[PDB]
Amino acid sequence: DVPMSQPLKEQEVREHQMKKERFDRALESKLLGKRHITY
Amino acid sequence: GEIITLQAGQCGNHVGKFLWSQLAKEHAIGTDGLSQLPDSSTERDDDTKPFFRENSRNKFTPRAIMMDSEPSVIADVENTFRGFFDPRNTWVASDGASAGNSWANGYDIGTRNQDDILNKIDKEIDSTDNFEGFQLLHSVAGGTGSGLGSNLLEALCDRYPKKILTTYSVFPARSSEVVVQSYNTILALRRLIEDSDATVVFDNASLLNISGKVFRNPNIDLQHTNQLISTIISSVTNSIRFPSYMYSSMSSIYSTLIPSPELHFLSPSFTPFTSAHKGHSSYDVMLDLLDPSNSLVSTAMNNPTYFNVYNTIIGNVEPRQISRAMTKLQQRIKFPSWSSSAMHVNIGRRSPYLPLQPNENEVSGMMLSNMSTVVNVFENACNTFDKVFAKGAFLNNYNVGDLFQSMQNVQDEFAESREVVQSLMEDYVAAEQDSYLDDVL
Amino acid sequence: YDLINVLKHLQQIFLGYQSGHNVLKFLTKNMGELTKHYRNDNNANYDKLLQNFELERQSENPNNLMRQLLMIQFDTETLPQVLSHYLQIYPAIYHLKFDINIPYPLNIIISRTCMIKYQIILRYQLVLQYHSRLLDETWMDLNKTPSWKYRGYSHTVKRRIVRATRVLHAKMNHFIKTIMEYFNQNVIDKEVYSLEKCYRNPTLAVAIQNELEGGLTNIMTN
Numbered sequence: 001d002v003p004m005s006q007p008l009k010e011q012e013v014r015e016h017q018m019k020k021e022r023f024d025r026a027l028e029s030k031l032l033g034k035r036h037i038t039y
Numbered sequence: 040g041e042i043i044t045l046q047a048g049q050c051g052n053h054v055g056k057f058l059w060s061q062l063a064k065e066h067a068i069g070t071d072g073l074s075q076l077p078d079s080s081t082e083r084d085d086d087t088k089p090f091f092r093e094n095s096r097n098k099f100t101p102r103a104i105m106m107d108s109e110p111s112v113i114a115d116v117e118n119t120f121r122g123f124f125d126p127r128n129t130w131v132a133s134d135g136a137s138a139g140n141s142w143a144n145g146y147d148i149g150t151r152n153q154d155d156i157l158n159k160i161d162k163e164i165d166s167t168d169n170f171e172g173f174q175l176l177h178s179v180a181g182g183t184g185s186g187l188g189s190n191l192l193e194a195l196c197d198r199y200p201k202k203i204l205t206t207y208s209v210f211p212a213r214s215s216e217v218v219v220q221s222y223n224t225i226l227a228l229r230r231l232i233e234d235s236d237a238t239v240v241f242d243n244a245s246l247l248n249i250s251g252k253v254f255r256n257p258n259i260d261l262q263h264t265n266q267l268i269s270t271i272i273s274s275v276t277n278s279i280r281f282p283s284y285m286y287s288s289m290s291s292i293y294s295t296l297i298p299s300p301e302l303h304f305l306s307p308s309f310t311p312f313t314s315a316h317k318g319h320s321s322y323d324v325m326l327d328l329l330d331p332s333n334s335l336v337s338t339a340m341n342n343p344t345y346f347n348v349y350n351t352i353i354g355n356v357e358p359r360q361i362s363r364a365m366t367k368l369q370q371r372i373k374f375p376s377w378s379s380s381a382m383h384v385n386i387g388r389r390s391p392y393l394p395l396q397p398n399e400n401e402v403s404g405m406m407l408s409n410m411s412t413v414v415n416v417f418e419n420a421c422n423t424f425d426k427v428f429a430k431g432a433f434l435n436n437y438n439v440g441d442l443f444q445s446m447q448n449v450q451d452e453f454a455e456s457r458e459v460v461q462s463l464m465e466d467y468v469a470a471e472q473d474s475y476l477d478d479v480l
Numbered sequence: 481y482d483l484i485n486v487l488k489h490l491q492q493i494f495l496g497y498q499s500g501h502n503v504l505k506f507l508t509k510n511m512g513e514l515t516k517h518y519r520n521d522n523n524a525n526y527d528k529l530l531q532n533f534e535l536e537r538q539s540e541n542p543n544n545l546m547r548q549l550l551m552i553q554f555d556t557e558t559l560p561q562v563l564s565h566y567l568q569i570y571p572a573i574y575h576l577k578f579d580i581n582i583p584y585p586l587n588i589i590i591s592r593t594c595m596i597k598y599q600i601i602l603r604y605q606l607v608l609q610y611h612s613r614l615l616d617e618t619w620m621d622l623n624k625t626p627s628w629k630y631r632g633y634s635h636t637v638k639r640r641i642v643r644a645t646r647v648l649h650a651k652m653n654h655f656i657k658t659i660m661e662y663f664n665q666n667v668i669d670k671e672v673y674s675l676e677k678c679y680r681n682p683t684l685a686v687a688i689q690n691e692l693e694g695g696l697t698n699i700m701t702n
């Protein structure tokens with residue numbers, strides 16, 4: 001047959017979650033960077 | 040921010056008794072003024088400050104002064120509320136019982152004893168700092184009541200030009216005494232055009248009909264209508280007595296409801312309520328608020344021209360029915376093309392210290408409308424006055440003081456009242472036209 | 481520690497939830513101070529405002545530690561400036577903010593990121609409430625001053641100047657108040673309700689903090 005089209009609801013929720021994650025990661029990197037690595 | 044209540048006439052005394060009882064039950068103050076809440080938790084979300092003064096005894100004295108020419112009704116209200124009101128906030132003019140249902144005698148009583156009332160209101164205002172305005176409870180039909188109301192309105196406009204003054208006035212029903220009662224009304228109405236910053240209208244005939252509808256016994260007592268008015272006043276003040284985020288001032292409500300000082304007469308509606316099941320959704324609540332059989336005034340209009348409408352829904356409501364009813368109402372209510380189609384809804388929180396009203400969990404709603412129905416009752420009253428005046432010269436027999444020394448000045452004052460209410464209704468009916476704001480477009 | 485009372489206090493403080501009266505009183509008491517501090521420079525003394533704030537905090541009940549530990553401060557940047565700093569957007573007013581020093585062991589749950597979110601939301605709500613207060617004061621000056629309501633001398637002005645600006649103020653009120661009610665009901669009210677319903681029989685405090693920060697994000701990502 002033909003390759004199935006990627007679902008519309010799937011790409012909508014994916015772009016929403018990706019926008020939210022980009023904002024969250026930007027805000028987290030802006031807030032002093034709690035993540036650390038030490039020696 | 041603090042507001043003072045003014046109970047004029049026996050009607051004012053009755054409605055003040057009912058309203059203060061209702062508020063004491065809501066704010067858990069009771070008939071003794073003492074805090075019905077325990078002293079272990081001081082966290083509160085209401086505001087008893089603008090309506091109650093709390094002393095070292097933690098007793099809440101109602102911020103109200105009663106003015107009347109009949110001491111018996113005030114004494115009875117004191118008896119039913121022994122230990123609630125302050126005896127110093129009582130004013131009976133020290134003239135004995137009432138005499139004469141004309142506006143002349145009432146206004147003369149007000150002018151003679153104006154100093155005592157001025158001292159009382161000055162003492163009440165000096166008790167606190169953040170004051171905003173007064174609340175007047177009177178019937179335009181009552182002669183002494185209307186005279187006292189007009190006198191205090193003049194005093195508060197030429198004394199406190201910075202304090203917005205609103206009043207509650209109930210127009211009489213279709214009866215016989217109107218032939219003189221209407222007189223007082225228009226005279227008071229004259230001052231209502233000049234000094235009154237805001238006014239909520241009521242029609243006694245529609246009030247009696249709606250009470251007979253909601254009450255089982257058609258023999259409607261006047262105290263039942265007083266209870267209805269106390270409920271509507273407590274409802275419109277719910278946003279003030281229970282502010283959360285949005286509405287914390289009556290100035291904002293009169294901003295969103297009164298567009299211009301020439302148009303400050305609003306018609307109320309409240310539904311559903313008791314005075315025990317829930318069968319009126321918020322959508323149903325609002326479509327009933329639109330229904331004429333739920334307004335506190337005789338509509339007598341097919342399609343009234345709504346100018347600015349604003350409502351407060353009491354109960355736990357979801358915004359979906361809110362939006363559905365808003366869309367339906369915009370499809371139903373017509374606005375002039377020169378004005379805005381503004382519709383605003385306030386979510387009024389319920390008091391946890393108030394006993395549960397019958398029909399629990401039944402969402403209710405109040406609405407205040409500015410339309411051409413108030414001017415219909417105004418036209419009825421003015422037509423009755425014009426008939427009884429141009430047809431019979433009997434008002435020249437019941438006058439006091441400056442009005443009794445000469446009746447020609449009384450006739451001139453009545454003609455001027457007719458002229459100013461005519462100009463007012465003409466401004467109203469012109470506002471219904473898109474050409475009202477044509478001077479800018 | 482009765483976390484419910486603490487979260488209620490912080491919602492009253494930074495979110496204005498059921499606390500519009502206190503912030504409205506604080507704004508009405510010092511409208512002139514705010515406008516004189518926002519029209520002047522940073523060198524202008526604001527110690528009078530700080531004294532008023534500490535007096536109001538002293539008049540506050542001592543049990544509300546969130547309000548008893550409330551501290552005020554002046555920033556060097558505006559609210560759109562810090563918004564451009566934290567978020568990729570393009571913008572000397574609104575330099576005020578409030579902060580709380582979360583102690584141990586409350587600081588392990590109430591971190592500093594949520595505190596910064598609270599400060600941002602509080603400054604935003606302060607801007608909104610000050611603008612609504614300015615609109616209310618304008619309506620009061622229009623409806624109470626006799627000159628504004630007075631008319632005469634073949635007016636041509638009332639219908640053209642007064643009526644026009646009154647309609648314009650009505651438009652501004654129908655915009656600001658509408659958007660305020662929308663944001664406080666569809667965003668603030670819903671998030672408050674979710675925060676109320678989530679702590680019912682909790683499982684993980686880290687999960688509670690994650691839900692709180694997710695609600696803050698939904699507020700921001702609107």
Ligand SMILES: Nc1nc2c(ncn2[C@@H]2O[C@H](COP(=O)(O)OP(=O)(O)OP(=O)(O)O)[C@@H](O)[C@H]2O)c(=O)[nH]1
Pocket residue numbers: 048049050051053108109137138139140178180181182183184185209210211212243261262264265
């Ligand atoms: N709804 C309602 N209206 C009342 C009540 N009492 C008086 N009124 C109004 O008052 C009008 C009658 O006039 P009065 O109340 O006697 O006022 P007055 O003529 O100045 O006489 P006094 O009050 O004794 O001074 C009626 O038309 C009613 O509208 C009441 O208890 N309930």
